Scaffold this active site. Structure first.
Site, PDB file in Angstrom:
ATOM      1  N   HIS A 193      -2.994  -3.032   8.238  1.00  0.00           N
ATOM      2  CA  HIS A 193      -3.996  -3.281   7.163  1.00  0.00           C
ATOM      3  C   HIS A 193      -4.463  -1.929   6.585  1.00  0.00           C
ATOM      4  CE1 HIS A 193      -4.560  -7.553   7.661  1.00  0.00           C
ATOM      5  NE2 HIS A 193      -4.580  -7.357   8.972  1.00  0.00           N
ATOM      6  N   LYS A 204      -6.504  -8.375  -8.933  1.00  0.00           N
ATOM      7  CA  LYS A 204      -7.708  -8.004  -8.202  1.00  0.00           C
ATOM      8  C   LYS A 204      -8.299  -6.710  -8.742  1.00  0.00           C
ATOM      9  CE  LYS A 204      -7.111  -7.158  -3.874  1.00  0.00           C
ATOM     10  NZ  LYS A 204      -7.961  -5.955  -3.636  1.00  0.00           N
ATOM     11  N   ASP A 205      -9.543  -6.389  -8.353  1.00  0.00           N
ATOM     12  CA  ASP A 205     -10.243  -5.250  -8.988  1.00  0.00           C
ATOM     13  C   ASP A 205      -9.731  -3.880  -8.605  1.00  0.00           C
ATOM     14  OD1 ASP A 205     -12.052  -7.024 -10.193  1.00  0.00           O
ATOM     15  OD2 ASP A 205     -13.835  -6.093  -9.302  1.00  0.00           O
ATOM     16  N   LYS A 206      -9.100  -3.759  -7.441  1.00  0.00           N
ATOM     17  CA  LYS A 206      -8.693  -2.430  -6.990  1.00  0.00           C
ATOM     18  C   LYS A 206      -7.526  -2.575  -6.038  1.00  0.00           C
ATOM     19  CE  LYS A 206      -9.862  -0.324  -3.512  1.00  0.00           C
ATOM     20  NZ  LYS A 206     -11.313  -0.117  -3.049  1.00  0.00           N
ATOM     21  N   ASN A 207      -6.750  -1.493  -5.934  1.00  0.00           N
ATOM     22  CA  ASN A 207      -5.782  -1.380  -4.849  1.00  0.00           C
ATOM     23  C   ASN A 207      -5.449   0.081  -4.706  1.00  0.00           C
ATOM     24  OD1 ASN A 207      -4.033  -3.112  -2.866  1.00  0.00           O
ATOM     25  ND2 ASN A 207      -2.608  -1.515  -3.635  1.00  0.00           N
ATOM     26  N   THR A 208      -5.527   0.553  -3.454  1.00  0.00           N
ATOM     27  CA  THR A 208      -5.165   1.910  -3.099  1.00  0.00           C
ATOM     28  C   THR A 208      -3.733   1.963  -2.624  1.00  0.00           C
ATOM     29  OG1 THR A 208      -7.485   2.316  -2.492  1.00  0.00           O
ATOM     30  CG2 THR A 208      -5.877   3.980  -1.888  1.00  0.00           C
ATOM     31  N   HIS A 210       0.753  -1.247   0.000  1.00  0.00           N
ATOM     32  CA  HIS A 210       0.000   0.000   0.000  1.00  0.00           C
ATOM     33  C   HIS A 210       0.779   1.289   0.000  1.00  0.00           C
ATOM     34  CE1 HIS A 210      -3.969  -1.845   0.182  1.00  0.00           C
ATOM     35  NE2 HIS A 210      -3.515  -2.664   1.126  1.00  0.00           N
TER      36      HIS A 210
END
Length: 104
Positions: free
Chosen positions: A97, A31-35, A10
């Protein structure tokens, strides 16, 4: 799950995250997203200073964010840049997390 992995998952050293490249690696597995948070590690670690037991914390300041949002083509992404607060789980004085943008 821990501060080492949180940095890898992250935190980005470059704002222009190469989404179609990085998102395709095992860590993110298409995967669909990651910030991602555009910062060196210490000001991000500092969000959690003093917090021992697991607790979700919304940042006091806004950060530069880079999101990899999937398109209609699997594992191909748009990069979207924004400035916002974000929520992380603090544990033993470090982020472990990423919870979400804007709110816990």
């Amino acid at each position: 799950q821990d501060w080492l992995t949180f940095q890898k998952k992250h935190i980005t050293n470059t704002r222009d995250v190469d989404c179609d490249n990085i998102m395709s690696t095992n860590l993110f597995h298409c995967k669909d997203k990651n910030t991602f948070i555009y910062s060196r590690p210490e000001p991000v670690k500092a969000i959690c200073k003093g917090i021992i037991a697991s607790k979700n914390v919304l940042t006091t300041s806004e950060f530069y964010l880079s999101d990899c949002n999937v398109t209609s083509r699997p594992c191909k992404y748009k990069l979207k840049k924004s400035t916002n607060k974000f929520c992380v789980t603090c544990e033993n004085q470090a982020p472990v997390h990423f919870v979400g943008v804007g709110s816990c």
